[PDB]
Structures are given as C-alpha cells and as structure tokens.
Design a protein around this ligand. Structure first.
Ligand SMILES: *C(=O)CCSCCCCCCCCCCCC
Ligand SMILES: [Zn+2]
Lengths: 289, 6
C-alpha cells in the first residue's frame, strides 16, 4: 500500500535510492544550526534589555518600533553576532542532495545564512523569515542593497546603518514581527508540493506558523522523515505527523542531534565518505579565511 | 500576511 517498506531510517534510505524518489523538499529550523553555535532565537531559554526603555519586550523585534528606534535592535545584534559562520553537517548534507539532483527546495526558518555558505543557491532556498545575508535601505524609492560585510562593520562600530544614497535606515533582510512574510514562501509552496517525493524535516519543533503547516501540504503518499532531538508535528490532543499509531504509514522519527541523523542517513545511502570529505574541506576553507 | 509570535 505504502511507499516506505518500513517506518525506519533504513526504509527511508531504500526509498531514496529507488526510482520513485526523485524530488526532496527539506524543511529546516534552528536545530540544524545550534551545533554551529547559533542560538534558537525563538526559544525563551535563549537570552533575548532594561536600558532600552521599550514600551513592551517584543518591541525590539516589531518593524514599526525598529523604524523609529533602531538602536536597541542593533545593540542586540552586536551582542549576538556569531564569532564564525561555519555550516553544520546537516547543511552540507543538503548540499549533497543538491549535487545529486535530488533537492527540489530547502525551506528554512533560519536567518543565519548558513544554507548559502554551504552552497545552496537562491533558486534552491525559501528563506521563510528572511536572512541577514543582505540588507536594504528602508526607503521605498531607493531600496539600495548592502552585503553582510557592510552591515557587520556598522554593527560592530556601533554606527546605526544609514543608506549612502539617501541616508535612510538600512535594515537586515530578516522579517521583523509585523512585516509581511515573503511572497516567495507562498508562491513556491503552491508549486513545490505538487512535485515532492520526500519531506525531510530537520531541526524544527514545528511550532511556528505558517511554516509549520508546510507538512500538511505534502501529498498523502509522500513519506516524511523527522530528524530532531524531540518528536514533533503530531496533532495537538487539546484541539499532523503520525509516527506511532496503528494507522501510521509514512512518517518516521529519528531522535537525536541533527548532525548525527544526517550522518546516519548518509551512511545508509553510501554517501558518508562524500559527506565527510565535503565538510572537512569546507570547514578547512572557512577556518583558513 | 504579517509575521507574528504564533
Ligand atoms: C523571525 O522568526 C525571524 C526574526 S527573529 C529576530 C532575531 C534577531 C536577533 C539576532 C540577529 C542578529 C545576530 C545574528 C546574525 C546572523 C547572521
Ligand atoms: Zn537609500
């Protein structure tokens, strides 16, 4: 009846190497970048400011506040700026998917740019919450684009970034609270899920909407593999993924560190040496910058 | 559609 011959990582790998599995969508969250040292910016456990005299805590991340008082956000950005941008094994696993002609799209909730550094191109990515990779002047008639190196030196020198052409504020291309979500998120979702053969859901607790609803856009037959520290995505009994019931037929949970799960899957696929070689090479290159 | 906590 079902595409997976069994509801295990081993069944997923067999399916991936069969003729039926041509197009993979990855859905990724903060869990794939924590081993790179990037904290989960939506987790209350991370330290996300009395000196700023905010009308309410969340105002640091609302667009209309930021546009009037951008200094609190950029002071926070300095505190949190990563010491290094080194993608994880999981990011390079997706680069291997791309190399092998299997990656339809990576939808990411992360703003940390590590997908791009690892070699995913614009066409491969839906950055559902934007990115720090680029920044734009906020004036609608200007919209001059600035690269991350430019924005980095403003953040560290503690100079509020202003546009060289028009002297308006320049904002990192992340989606602030109160901003529209990207049109590309909705356009790609309407097309990609007609074509997907496998969903790889990695490092997300599937608690943030509308990103979490992407799992319900897959065709009914499409297997869904969760690689995550904790099971996630099941329907909420107070009001989905079905891993464990007698009716389960396509969803598989691999519980552990995302890097270790991708390593395990690569090893089943015969890709472990390729993945190790890519990661060691790219890490060596980043370390040598 | 706007970005929010949920
Ligand atoms: C929506 O869920 C995404 C926006 S939440 C904004 C949190 C940003 C605070 C820290 C960002 C600056 C430091 C990280 C830079 C990574 C290139
Ligand atoms: Zn400008």
């Amino acid at each position: 009846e079902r595409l997976l011959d069994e509801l295990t990582l081993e069944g997923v790998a067999r399916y991936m190497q069969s003729e039926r599995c041509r197009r993979v969508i990855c859905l990724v969250g903060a869990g794939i970048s924590t081993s790179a040292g990037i904290p989960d910016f939506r987790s209350p456990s991370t330290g996300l400011l009395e000196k700023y005299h905010l009308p309410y805590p969340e105002a640091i991340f609302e667009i209309s506040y930021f546009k009037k008082h951008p200094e609190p956000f950029f002071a926070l950005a300095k505190e949190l700026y990563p010491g290094q941008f080194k993608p994880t094994i999981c990011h390079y696993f997706m680069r291997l998917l791309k190399d092998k002609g299997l990656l339809l799209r990576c939808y990411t909730q992360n703003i940390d740019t590590l997908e791009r550094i690892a070699g995913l191109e614009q066409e491969d990515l839906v950055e559902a919450h934007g990115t720090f990779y680029t920044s734009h002047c906020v004036s609608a008639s200007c919209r001059h684009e600035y690269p991350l190196s430019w924005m980095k030196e403003k953040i560290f020198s503690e100079v509020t970034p202003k546009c060289e052409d028009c002297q308006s504020l320049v904002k990192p291309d992340i989606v602030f609270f109160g901003e529209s979500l990207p049109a590309r998120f909705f356009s790609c979702m309407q097309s990609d899920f007609l074509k997907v053969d496998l969903l790889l859901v990695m490092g997300t607790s599937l608690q943030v909407q509308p990103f979490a609803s992407l799992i319900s856009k897959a065709p009914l037959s499409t297997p869904r593999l969760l690689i995550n520290k904790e099971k996630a995505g099941q329907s909420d009994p107070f009001l989905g993924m079905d891993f464990d019931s007698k009716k389960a037929y396509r969803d598989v949970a691999w519980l552990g560190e995302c890097d270790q799960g991708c390593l395990a899957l690569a090893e089943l696929l015969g890709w472990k040496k390729e993945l190790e070689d890519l990661v060691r090479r790219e890490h060596a290159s980043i370390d040598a910058q | 559609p706007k970005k929010y906590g949920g």
